[PDB]
Amino acid sequence: TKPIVFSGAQPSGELTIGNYMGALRQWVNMQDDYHCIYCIVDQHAITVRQDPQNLRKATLDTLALYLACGIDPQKSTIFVQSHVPEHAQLGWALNCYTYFGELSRMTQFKDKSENINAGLFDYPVLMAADILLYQTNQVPVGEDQKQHLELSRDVAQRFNAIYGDIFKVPEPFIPGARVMSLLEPTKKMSKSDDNRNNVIGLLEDPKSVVKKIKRAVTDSDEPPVVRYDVQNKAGVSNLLDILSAVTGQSIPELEQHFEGKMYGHLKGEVAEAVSGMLTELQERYHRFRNDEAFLNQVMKEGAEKASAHASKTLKAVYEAIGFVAKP
């Protein structure tokens, strides 16, 4: 039986080449060997105040972007969280099996903190419901969500001890390419960066892409030497890693290629490689994003697959708890 993988996607409308070449692009090629579920978590998004029109548009942006990256709605389950009522239903039930102190001591809650709302406090529980609803075996998680996945595992184990093996206990599972910040090559490229000159978005205009890459930090070696050395030449190594990730050429092959050349040549090839990659992705993105009837059909079928799987686990949860079954 295929492992079940659950991934939450904030409706931001933004991904970086780091997110894509590092995580998503590889997952696109694993949709046949895993049961991949992608959930656009608009219910988590409103734990911070959102402009309503931006939220709706960014939900569709994110959907069209995942489709353009290659998520196939036939092979995978992709949907909008609020379209599947089971997420909020199980979220409430798991509140009653979650300790108050488990939530009050979350780093995200103290790091987001009297002008705080209960959704910021409670969103770890909704996250646990998102995962446990689908008998999830694996969850891709960054270091910042690690504490949240641990709670989901603790709640699944706590519930199972009381009522039987109802939930699968999820595990972290992070498999690709190493993409660092353009002006700070010792820090991973992050979509949350304040300095946007460190980041290349998948939907960034190609003109701005070449500009940012030409600004990418390199070293003061005289004469310049294009070789991979992360400790001494972090900037040059980062550009080599990005170029290798886009073109498939190995680092040694690129080194021989740039023997005797300046860092400007490396930046030039990186810029046109990345720009070409974003050009292909953006052609697909605009096709999908300007056909909102297609997007609606994807959302409808995705939510129906999601609800059909999710309601099996919710019904088992309600039976164990002692709710009268819905006729």
Ligand X SMILES: N[C@@H](Cc1c[nH]c2ccccc12)C(=O)O
Residues with active-site annotation? 112, 188, 191
Bridge partners (DSSP) listed for residue 39: 8, 79
140 binds Cl ion (CB under 5 A): no
Mark the binding-site residues for L-tryptophan, compressed into ranges.
Answer: 130
Q: Which residue has the tokens 């049961």?
A: 35
Q: How many CB atoms lie within 10 A of CB 159?
A: 22
Q: How many CB atoms lie within 10 A of CB 158?
A: 15
In the complex, least distance from residue 113 CB atom to its own copies, rounded to whole angstroms: 9
82 binds ligand X (CB under 6 A): no
Closer Cβ to its own copies, 91 or 185, answer by number: 91
Closest Cα to residue 7, out of 121, 102, 137, 179? 137
Closer Cβ to Cl ion, 17 or 156, answer by number: 17
Closer Cβ to ligand X, 146 or 215, answer by number: 146
Report d(CA 3, CA 195) in Å as an integer.
38
Report d(CA 47, CA 116) in Å as an integer.
9
Q: Which stretch binds ligand X (CB under 6 A): 57-65, 124-132, 185-193, 204-212?
A: 124-132
Following DSSP, what letter does each residue of 238-272 receive, concatenated?
A: HHHHHHHHHH---HHHHHHHTTT--HHHHHHHHHH
Task: Determine which helix (DSSP H) or strand (DSSP E) holds 77, and give its type and residue range.
Answer: strand 77-80
Closer Cβ to ligand X, 151 or 298, answer by number: 151
Closer Cβ to Cl ion, 102 or 193, answer by number: 193
In the complex, least distance from residue 19 CB atom to ligand X, rounded to whole angstroms: 11
184 binds Cl ion (CB under 5 A): no
Closest Cα to residue 123, out of 215, 220, 33, 8? 8
Residue partners of 23: CB distance under 8 A and separation at least 6 = 140, 174, 175, 176
56 binds its own copies (CB under 8 A): yes
Read off the tokens for 180: 């660092």
Report d(CA 250, CA 115) in Å as an integer.
51
Kindly identify the residues of this chain, within the stretch 3-32, that bind ligand X according to CB under 6 A. Answer: 6-8, 10
234 binds Cl ion (CB under 5 A): yes
Breaks in the chain (C–N beyond 2.5 Å) sit after: 113, 175
Residue partners of 18: CB distance under 8 A and separation at least 6 = 179, 188, 189, 190, 191, 199
> 130 contacts which partner out of its own copies, ligand X, Cl ion, none, CB within 5 to 8 A by kind?
ligand X
Mark the binding-site residues for Ca(2+), compressed into ranges.
Answer: 72, 74
255 binds Cl ion (CB under 5 A): no
- Return the SS3 of 327: coil
Report d(CA 133, CA 168) in Å as an integer.
9
156 binds Cl ion (CB under 5 A): no
Closer Cβ to Cl ion, 85 or 142, answer by number: 142
For its own copies, what does the binding mask look like between residues 205 and 244, x meaning CB under 8 A?
----------------------------------------
In the complex, least distance from residue 60 CB atom to ligand X, rounded to whole angstroms: 18
1 binds its own copies (CB under 8 A): no
In the complex, least distance from residue 133 CB atom to its own copies, rounded to whole angstroms: 13
For ligand X, what does the binding mask look like between residues 35 and 54, x meaning CB under 6 A?
------x--x----------
Read off the tokens for 39: 């959930």
Q: Report the interface residues with its own copies, using CB under 8 A.
A: 42-43, 46-47, 50-56, 59-60, 80, 82-83, 85-86, 88-89, 91-93, 95-103, 114-122, 125-126, 163, 296-297, 299-300, 303, 318, 320-324, 326-327
Q: Report the interface residues with ligand X, using CB under 6 A.
A: 6-8, 10, 41, 44, 127, 130-131, 139, 141, 145
